Subunit: 248 residues, 3 copies
């Protein structure tokens, strides 16, 4: 197999990015091409599809001789990456053998070897879906709304109308409603083709947003009785996309 070397400036930031996907994933196949790094995986229950796209442009050095796929234990990967410091340079290197060499370069050079595994590749595509509502909002609003809703229920209803986006949860001894309009600082964009209603499991939503930053811009696309697509951008050009099955 052909070697590669991939270098990312800011090892802690890369660890943070991986930790977001790791919240739902135990293991994943990483497709390494000359265009960038991609990872498409499902959580163990098959409710959430994760797609992480890291173009060559976000890496300070990118040397990929031929496209290849590697399998990674995501919890082992995250344990090693968590050792990286904020100003470390991260080097991901594969030689001829079946392990990933992970180097942090900073005040010292620290090199871990991570055994590569084989990950069953389900044929996963990200199909186009007839979403009728798009919402762009601040991470902090999304994160707090999911925490708010968890105080009352295990499911969160998403309601998009022309002028307002509402997330509402109801339980026996409580009720919570989070409302956004374009007058609100938390709502950056709202495009609604038609009144759209769908509900989503809070346990999955919590794991999806756990690593998202309070100042991150999160795009939500959904439809009535349809999955929720949730994405935010990494270093402008990278993209993390979640696709979440509705609660029906």
């Amino acid at each position: 197999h052909m070697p590669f070397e991939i270098v990312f400036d800011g090892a802690k930031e890369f660890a943070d990015l991986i930790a977001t996907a790791s919240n739902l994933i135990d293991e994943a196949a990483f497709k390494i091409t000359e265009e960038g790094v991609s990872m498409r995986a499902m959580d163990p229950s098959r409710v959430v599809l994760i797609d992480l796209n890291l173009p060559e442009s976000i890496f300070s050095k990118y040397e990929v001789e031929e496209p290849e796929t590697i399998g990674i234990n995501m919890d082992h990967f995250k344990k090693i990456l968590k050792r990286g410091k904020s100003k470390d340079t991260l080097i991901l290197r594969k030689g001829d053998e079946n392990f990933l060499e992970i180097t942090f370069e900073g005040t010292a050079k620290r090199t871990f070897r991570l055994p590569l595994i084989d990950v069953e590749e389900l044929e996963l595509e990200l199909p186009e879906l007839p979403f009728t509502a798009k919402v762009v909002l601040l991470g902090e609003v999304l994160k707090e709304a999911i925490k708010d809703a968890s105080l009352v229920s295990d499911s969160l209803k998403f309601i998009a109308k022309e002028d307002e986006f509402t997330m509402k949860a109801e339980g026996e001894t409580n009720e919570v409603e989070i409302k956004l309009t374009l007058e609100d600082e938390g709502l950056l964009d709202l495009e609604v083709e038609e009144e759209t209603r769908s509900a989503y499991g809070i346990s999955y939503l919590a794991d999806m947003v756990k690593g998202i930053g309070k100042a991150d811009e999160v795009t939500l696309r959904f439809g009535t009785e349809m999955p929720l697509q949730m994405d935010y951008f990494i270093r402008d050009e990278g993209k993390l996309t979640f696709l979440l099955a509705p609660r029906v």
Copy 2:
């Protein structure tokens, strides 16, 4: 029943204030008048009386049509209020029905409904007591002294003399003494009619001071073999008062 709307700027600060009283209280009757909000309660053991007085002046909007009392599960109340952000506006609103509508207004509008309960009203008054000692001290000194004393004992002796205030705890394998004079930065005022000695349970004192700030000014009034009155001010005009039975 008549509706009301009460608005407080700084929702996290209001949550912090409630959490102080919640440390000893499971449930409480809130008396809502045109003059302000008051709450008088005892801890489950009847050792501590809590009195919280929030005048209309500390609220940015105060619309109370007729005086009424509402009962609140304090742990449920604190769980909701803990969701408020530091720059959220807090709205407490009662309509015709038997629930409190709690709204945080900031980057988004988030509305919780809290069921109102019935709280048995003991006839609680705050009687005047012939205290012989008044002490004003920095919260940090009070908080640290109670923590210091807990290393050695379950009771803390308070000793006030003309020129010095001493808090002393004694155990078998330790002893601790905290001493203040007006030369000390921690002691803001000391008024002693006569030498005054009393002891107080550390477990109650710890719960009383847990939420007090290190820079808060705490007034202590006590007497020999008499209860301890402990108060500090909220937004200059609000007042939290504890009355603690002596250890005899």
Copy 3:
């Protein structure tokens, strides 16, 4: 027995210093002389020798009438010292009786009495050893390397050569190597008489470095199949020295 009074400006810093030695020690004899305070102890397994030397020069007041030794329960000592604030003045005073009076002077005067104990004095000396390698490195590199290695193994190999210092750990499903050269910011000095290799137990190393600061300069001296000497300086003139038996 003769009284003494020893005063240290910055009580939290003194607590931090004691906590470093306390990580391996349950009890210790402190030798109090006119020259300073010294403490030599072994951990319960006799794998680590600790030597703490605090010259009179680091104390703001130092009144020792005659040399004497006192025994101290280190966990009780650390519990009291942890109550000191960063800007507290610390007073250690012994009167005629068999207890240490520990005073924090700041916003208030707080005085603890700590019973002195008798500590069996093993005849402990710090012998000169024919070390062949000296390494000066930043605490953060040492601390992170030990944490890195603990991800893969229970022992850490130290390898010093003319131009590079390597710490390497190997396990079944992982491997880690931390490498320093004088080009690296983490390596302040490297003096190697000959190629030097030795291994050390990570559990002991972790407890030795737990309290060391990320910006502290740590000197390591070791030899092949020889103990590791690890020291760093306290207020320029104080010294904490660990001597760690090799893993053979």
